[PDB]
Design a protein around this ligand. Sequence first.
Ligand SMILES: CCC(=O)n1c(=O)n(CCOc2cc(Cl)ccc2Oc2cc(Cl)cc(C#N)c2)c2ccccc21
Lengths: 550, 403
Amino acid sequence: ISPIETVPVKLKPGMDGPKVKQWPLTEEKIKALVEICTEMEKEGKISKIGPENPYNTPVFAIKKKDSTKWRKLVDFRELNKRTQDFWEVQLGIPHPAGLKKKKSVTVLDVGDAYFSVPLDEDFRKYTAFTIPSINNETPGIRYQYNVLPQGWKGSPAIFQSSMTKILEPFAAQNPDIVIYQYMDDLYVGSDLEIGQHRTKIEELRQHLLRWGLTTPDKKHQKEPPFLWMGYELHPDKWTVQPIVLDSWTVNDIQKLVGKLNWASQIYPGIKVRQLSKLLRGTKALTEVIPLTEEAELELAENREILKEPVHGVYYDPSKDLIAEIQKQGQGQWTYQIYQEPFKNLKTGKYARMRGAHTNDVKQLTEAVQKITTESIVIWGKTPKFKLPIQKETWETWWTEYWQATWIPEWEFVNTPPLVKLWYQLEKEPIVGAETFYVDGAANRETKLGKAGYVTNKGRQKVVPLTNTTNQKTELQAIYLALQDSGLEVNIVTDSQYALGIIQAQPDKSESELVNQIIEQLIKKEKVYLAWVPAHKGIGGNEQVDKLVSA
Amino acid sequence: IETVPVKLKPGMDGPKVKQWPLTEEKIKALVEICTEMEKEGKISKIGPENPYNTPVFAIKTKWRKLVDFRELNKRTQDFWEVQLGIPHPAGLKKKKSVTVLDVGDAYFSVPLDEDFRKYTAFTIPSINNETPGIRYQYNVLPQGWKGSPAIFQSSMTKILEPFKKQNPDIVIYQYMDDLYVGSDLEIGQHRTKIEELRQHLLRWGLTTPDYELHPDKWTVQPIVLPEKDSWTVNDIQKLVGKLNWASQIYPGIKVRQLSKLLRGTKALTEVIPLTEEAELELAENREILKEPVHGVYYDPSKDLIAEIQKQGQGQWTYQIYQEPFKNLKTGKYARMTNDVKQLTEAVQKITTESIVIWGKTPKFKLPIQKETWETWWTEYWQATWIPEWEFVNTPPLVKLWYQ
Ligand SMILES: CCC(=O)n1c(=O)n(CCOc2cc(Cl)ccc2Oc2cc(Cl)cc(C#N)c2)c2ccccc21
């Protein structure tokens, strides 16, 4: 229908067209498929063909809802499997928070979008279909498309591409208007007078029509309820569309978690830590699951948050973005982004990425990272941060931290809980502090071994252990030397493993053993840990290795 | 003009790479740049039947486009490294001064094979997905592409022939987009010659943006053990550790004598007198460590690797190497700054050195979390090229023992 140029399309390199058999169909449907195709034929959308074309893909008819009018559905699965790859249509949807507030906004959907755009001539042959014959006697009637088939791999991208072409000139002639594109929809917004906006919107309709694209006129949707891709878009604010939810299957769990995650855009401090732990093993969507008092309390808190309706603002270039982060529980964080002091653009959560021996400063730095990136996508700049960590605490951390790390303009926010370093090892051996020489060892068959230490004042100890790995013993030894120590200890291991864990100053871990070490390292006044190579004839080491290896 | 035919390595498809999202200042810059380029026919907008993609950035008072043709190069340059390759002078590493000119503009005058052009596709992206990205592809030789200097190599010899004759003692090397000009004259004299060359180039149509390197001054970072008068037990334990490590890089290291000192179960702070045997064993090891490591050769077949450690106080050490302990070079940058600004300045220093020495960039292992590096590298970056990199996220627990 459009005088628009066509996009050259080609089948995959070593593949050829489809040749599927058309199945028989209730004769009532055959009549409908005939009327629909005849009308399409009349509009140039499809053209009849002869037996020369050897390609076929199947056709079908669905009741068309309760309309009881029938609709044509071709199945293009084979063809798509043989149609070349395209430059994919963008998967990301615009986040309402990045929509710049504009006085007037119009939504213009495009009618029979795909069918309004030509198809590469040389590709049409493959878009061939057969209307089944009434009786098995009479060959069926045959067709091919001259416009973008609806099931086809390529219709979206080609539709998109042709619309972009048709907008470039207009959008240039009129910089005062901001046109956005998502699937068949064109969202136009302006800061002109209502009359000037409508005049340009009509001029736009006018333009699109000259290219064979129709649009509503004063059947355009009404602003108040712009229900869009899961959101309510009101001219003054946006929210999430209302979210419902007591059921305890597995699939019920994932749907719930997803709904909660969707609500976390804007509803502060929705929680899903516990409930996501109940997704262990999974697979069986029907499998029932026990409602922990920790997770079923979670869901209690959540319903209360969902009783209050929350809205977010649109975005204002003139103003700064601010982002402020709160520590919420363990390994759970939460963040708001806003421009005015209580009018949020959006919120969200960040949860502790998979990994053992984590630490709150490291996590904070990580969370700043996800927010920074998020910001660039939605707004195209980074926010100013408001973080609950003193610059004493941060500057100490980054100066000693082995990686490069960076956090942009930020300001302390004295709101507990504050991010702190729970301990700090000494840089230099401590004078007048018992020097514990530790080691551990285990037997890879018996899953058994020993932990122990030997000190300068002659102190010694060994305990036996069961179901242990060599590392777990290397680390257990450290634990002993701590437990049997003063406020000031020097410890000497050969374990690169154990050294590493502790030197990275973990603030928590799933390894209870580490947590004991950590909780010990806090109570201590001073600790210096030091490393020596193994089996190299070093003193305490050689003695301690004999103690617990044989 | 005729187009040199270009074929990817076989059983290989063109690059399909996610465009990292950009800030709105860079995007504006990029639509400005690419608009001009298109009026001048360098590029042109493209359909959705071209599924390929190579990333694009804006680095900087005025803005500069930068394309990451690292995947395309890995899928094309390797063939052109054989078929159409470019020899590297062993003498450039020895010159007193090497200035580095940008001759990317040259490439915009040769056309590219029409059958190749689809593989040069890039996408100026869009904020918050308001719109599909702007898509273009190249009709001339692109600036990032290891093919481009290779094809232009012929023309480039014809332009430099007059100068290379009036000045047979200056070395000139071409690494994609840049001209390395090494002389052995006073900086002021060298500074003129270069200005004299810039004028040469402009006479024949090569614009050159309107630094100075001193490779003969370059030197490695020798391993240095401590030199103290009294040694605590800790002091000795550490010294044993460092040597015990050096043993990989250096045959001839001995710790018997010194480990003897640590006979018993002593406290770390206790001072220990140094036996004559150790003072000699120590004195022998120091000499070996001073001795330039000998017996490591550059094997063209193999990739170079660069590791970087963050020391304190604005300092960073590095090693470049092909096999684990067999180091081709080691170094230390101290800065005059964001850690990340420091780390990109290193990467660029190291790459340049490595271009000059071996006509090859290494593949970095960067001690920075991936997203932080992907978010901010283009902020400090001034090179026309981009090396390969991975991210080490496991602490180099190994004591720095690299100074
Ligand atoms: C006084 C302000 C006003 O009336 N409205 C307002 O500011 N917004 C925010 C979105 O603004 C847009 C700005 C531009 Cl340049 C373009 C389109 C916009 O709208 C879109 C965007 C999208 Cl991706 C989908 C849809 C749908 N469906 C609409 C509004 C949103 C809805 C209604 C009114 C306003």
